């Protein structure tokens, strides 16, 4: 028992709107007086192979865009384009605009996605940005424009917007500055993700969660250097561990009295010998979707 | 890739309040003009071995209870007791009281828990009521009074309130009529859960999800009777499958064109031979925390 938890979605549930442009609808985000959404809303199905987005944007009028906030309609009074993100200026400021940052996350960092169908919040989940900058979500038709966020104290920290999805549940998308995570473009050509590696610092975090929760069977007497851990790690498609990642594990290392390079030696043996049919926090697999901070904020 | 998703927590986030009674605080739920919470709020630490809850309730005055809705204080004007649930009548009706039912769920049914610390929403997760009527949640100090719910169209369907928790993440609690799920009492004596069995109809649902998402490797040519499935099921600590459960799998059986007793024969072989180190929706384990309806509403 150790729950993967999403942030309560109340504050983002406010900010969600349905954006339409021809027979293409998806979700938008409404902060102060600007409705943010994927720019591919302005495409026909015919013209998604290689859209000239500026030429497509030029042929649209402020009144081409049907923004709905409920069963209510909204008044568009300025279309703009930042990178792969359509910023629609609108009439009526969002009363519900919480304190917020637009933030960019690094691979391995976690966030909550409010999954929405046609402007209507449907479900919330916690994920990590994979090292190849894809999201293993659910493949849901109509979920383009759904956003990822962290809630830091008062402040809704928006980090992600869904642009493209595969039947494998594999999503790609942008920050709210409209720049893709990873080597992705918003056109329908063949596109390779990098090799998807296991997020080593998150597995270590989750072995610290396992300890804090009274699972000690995997703790060995032994120890390792960062370099000799990384020799093994890379044999098993684990990200190399960095001194910066060793540092953010510090607080869990102190709480449990298990030095980071001791937990690394624990992880090395699990990799080199496997689980032996045995179980950690009732998982068959080593889990990499908890950050050190995810464990700290939950394990206190 | 297939996301376990919680309901968006907006509507429940409204209804959450901090209840205090001496040096004991936990969470309450505020629907119309009644603040519902665990009755053990009225106990001292000393008197939790076998509290006489009526005698404890009698010695308290309407003004003994500190109900807070934010940094705001609330005015209590009538304490009552339904079963293990304290119903506090208060001044100020909840503006945010959504459409709601108080509902009782059966074992194996799923719901969202809004986890709260001291009246403050902290996190949301999707779980199933285990067959032994416990919840594998996170062990979080201050999470007593957190509620489970399903959101059915307009209607927040409240089904669960957390009363007691173990370091194993194993929670027990009541419906909002204050009756425990399972053989549990709200006093600190030794208490055994039943044997925790695997929720067969949910595993079948999730094999139908796996098919709908293009994982076919486990589909065998063969078929079985409900009785001969149940012979095997009970060997592997699976709940017996009922004709009623065979019925609620019908819609997934139609969507995929795989008859329920064919998917049962698929499940039998996975039980009798194991996974062979192989993977279903990228899980080592057969998963039992999706209902048939969980799959339908998500797989369309
Ligand atoms: C939601 O994100 C929406 C889902 C569709 C099923 C409607 N996505 C798009 O509309 C998006 C339009 C732009 C970004 C091209 N297209 C995709 O997300 C596309 C969906 C498939 C199922 C049609 N994703 C995709 O396949 O990646 C591009 C690609 C094309 C050809 C071969 C490999 C990869
Ligand atoms: C939240 O639910 C809160 C958590 C505590 C850690 C504060 N629960 C209670 O206060 C509750 C009070 C009533 C229901 C007795 N007590 C428990 O939930 C208790 C927590 C332990 C960690 C003290 N749960 C428990 O242990 O079950 C009862 C028990 C007692 C002795 C032996 C086995 C089982
Ligand atoms: Mg786009
Ligand atoms: Mg109680």
Tab-separated table of N, CA, C and O in Angstrom, chain B residues 16-17 42 84 205 207 244 298:
chain	number	residue	atom	x	y	z
B	16	UNK	N	-15.307	20.234	1.971
B	16	UNK	CA	-14.362	19.758	3.025
B	16	UNK	C	-14.161	20.842	4.089
B	16	UNK	O	-13.824	21.986	3.709
B	17	UNK	N	-14.254	20.449	5.373
B	17	UNK	CA	-14.057	21.323	6.569
B	17	UNK	C	-13.212	20.580	7.615
B	17	UNK	O	-13.219	19.330	7.614
B	42	UNK	N	-14.746	12.924	19.282
B	42	UNK	CA	-15.242	13.314	20.638
B	42	UNK	C	-14.474	12.545	21.725
B	42	UNK	O	-14.753	12.798	22.913
B	84	UNK	N	-21.727	5.439	13.425
B	84	UNK	CA	-20.337	5.847	13.780
B	84	UNK	C	-20.011	7.233	13.239
B	84	UNK	O	-18.831	7.639	13.327
B	205	UNK	N	-12.503	-7.476	-16.728
B	205	UNK	CA	-12.709	-6.121	-17.280
B	205	UNK	C	-11.379	-5.627	-17.871
B	205	UNK	O	-11.372	-5.140	-18.992
B	207	UNK	N	-8.694	-7.350	-18.685
B	207	UNK	CA	-8.251	-8.156	-19.856
B	207	UNK	C	-9.007	-7.660	-21.095
B	207	UNK	O	-8.417	-7.646	-22.159
B	244	UNK	N	-24.488	-12.683	-12.454
B	244	UNK	CA	-24.714	-11.208	-12.440
B	244	UNK	C	-23.445	-10.495	-12.931
B	244	UNK	O	-23.579	-9.519	-13.713
B	298	UNK	N	-14.125	4.685	-20.007
B	298	UNK	CA	-12.752	5.092	-20.425
B	298	UNK	C	-12.426	4.579	-21.842
B	298	UNK	O	-11.669	5.274	-22.542
